Amino acid sequence: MISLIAALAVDRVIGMENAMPWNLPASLAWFKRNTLDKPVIMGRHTWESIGRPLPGRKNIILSSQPGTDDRVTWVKSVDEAIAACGDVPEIMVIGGGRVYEQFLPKAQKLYLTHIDAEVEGDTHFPDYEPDDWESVSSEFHDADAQNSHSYCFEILERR
Amino acid sequence: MISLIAALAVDRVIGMENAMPWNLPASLAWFKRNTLDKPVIMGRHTWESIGRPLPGRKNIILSSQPGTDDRVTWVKSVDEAIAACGDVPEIMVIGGGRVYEQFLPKAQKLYLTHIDAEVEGDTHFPDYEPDDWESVSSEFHDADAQNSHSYCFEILERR
Numbered sequence: 001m002i003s004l005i006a007a008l009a010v011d012r013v014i015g016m017e018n019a020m021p022w023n024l025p026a027s028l029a030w031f032k033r034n035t036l037d038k039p040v041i042m043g044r045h046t047w048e049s050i051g052r053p054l055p056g057r058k059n060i061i062l063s064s065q066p067g068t069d070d071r072v073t074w075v076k077s078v079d080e081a082i083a084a085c086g087d088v089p090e091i092m093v094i095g096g097g098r099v100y101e102q103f104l105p106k107a108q109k110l111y112l113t114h115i116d117a118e119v120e121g122d123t124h125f126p127d128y129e130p131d132d133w134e135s136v137s138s139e140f141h142d143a144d145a146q147n148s149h150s151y152c153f154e155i156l157e158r159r
Numbered sequence: 160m161i162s163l164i165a166a167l168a169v170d171r172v173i174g175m176e177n178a179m180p181w182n183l184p185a186s187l188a189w190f191k192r193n194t195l196d197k198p199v200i201m202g203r204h205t206w207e208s209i210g211r212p213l214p215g216r217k218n219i220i221l222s223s224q225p226g227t228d229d230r231v232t233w234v235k236s237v238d239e240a241i242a243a244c245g246d247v248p249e250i251m252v253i254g255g256g257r258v259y260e261q262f263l264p265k266a267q268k269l270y271l272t273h274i275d276a277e278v279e280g281d282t283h284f285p286d287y288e289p290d291d292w293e294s295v296s297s298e299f300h301d302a303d304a305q306n307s308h309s310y311c312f313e314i315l316e317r318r
């Protein structure tokens with residue numbers, strides 16, 4: 001089963017190349033809890049933003065360019081990315097924009113962090129029609145001394 | 160000698176009701192570089208924001224109320240805070256507003272990270288006379304895969 005996991009600001013803006021303007025450790029912990037022990041597929045920009053292989057996860061990079069690093073798996077296509085994950089119960093797609101566009105058709109679950117921040121951006125998370133998706137769980141949290149903005153975790157299942 | 164180290168957004172903002180809306184690992188690395196192996200004096204609210212004692216530094220908290228963590232030294236006056244530093248060459252004051260207000264008149268140097276972020280702040284760095292300080296180093300960086308805003312590191316010496 002293929003799942004997409006993303007953090008969206010107002011209007012579905014998502015990061016593209018530069019780091020996003022927020023500091024949300026509670027949300028990164030949620031990202032960790034939900035991707036640990038599973039394979040993660042991401043594009044080149046995400047991988048440069050992360051800065052190293054996420055531990056406890058099989059790191060798969062989907063890019064047209066070559067593999068700088070040997071601690072992860074470099075693949076040139078969707079089928080190849082899918083294949084490198086082997087047979088597992090759940091494959092996590094962690095972005096960015098293009099990658100999400102490529103897997104959305106095949107996705108069965110969406111884990112999203114909705115963040116109350118207005119950010120000017122080019123890239124948007126794909127339009128997903130919530131009538132094609134059932135929201136199953138939602139949990140809001142206010143900003144605090146450690147989290148810059150209010151955020152809401154949402155899980156949706158494809159119907 | 161006492162030095163002040165601060166991160167200022169536009170208009171000298173240094174704090175907000177919640178965590179600052181930025182992700183700047185390169186500035187944190189500069190802050191560690193410049194405070195490592197030194198005593199650091201901070202107020203209670205800055206301590207609470209940090210979450211734990213800073214490693215490799217003697218952490219001193221200036222507060223009127225009693226201490227809640229045995230890992231650090233709690234002090235009730237400027238004089239006590241200084242004294243708790245012992246005999247070292249340089250004492251670093253890490254904020255917040257009021258604490259910077261009480262040490263500025265005794266400071267000979269300032270390490271400032273200026274960040275291009277326009278935000279509404281709650282506290283601000285005390286007003287410094289640009290005719291009383293000499294900029295001895297400056298270094299500009301744009302936002303990147305890991306840093307959400309452009310920033311500039313500056314060190315000033317009291318004329």
Ligand SMILES: CN(Cc1cnc2nc(N)nc(N)c2n1)c1ccc(C(=O)N[C@@H](CCC(=O)O)C(=O)O)cc1
Binds near residue numbers: 031032054094111
């Ligand atoms: C830039 N980036 C991609 C990123 C960040 N937050 C997201 N949040 C959501 N919900 N979804 C994503 N796809 C997402 N992707 C990052 C950056 C750092 C780490 C990271 O260091 N994670 C540690 C957790 C905290 C830590 O130890 O620093 C982990 O083990 O996953 C993860 C993703």
Ligand SMILES: CN(Cc1cnc2nc(N)nc(N)c2n1)c1ccc(C(=O)N[C@@H](CCC(=O)O)C(=O)O)cc1
Binds near residue numbers: 165205209
């Ligand atoms: C919120 N806060 C206060 C803070 C942040 N940046 C500043 N930056 C400057 N220039 N000056 C300050 N006084 C300042 N203070 C923090 C928060 C975290 C860490 C911290 O974890 N720094 C680690 C380095 C980064 C890391 O290990 O994650 C360290 O060892 O110093 C420091 C200060």
Ligand SMILES: [Ca+2]
Binds near residue numbers: 293295
């Ligand atoms: Ca100069």
Ligand SMILES: [Cl-]
Binds near residue numbers: 043
């Ligand atoms: Cl990407």
Ligand SMILES: [Cl-]
Binds near residue numbers: 202203206255256258
């Ligand atoms: Cl404080």
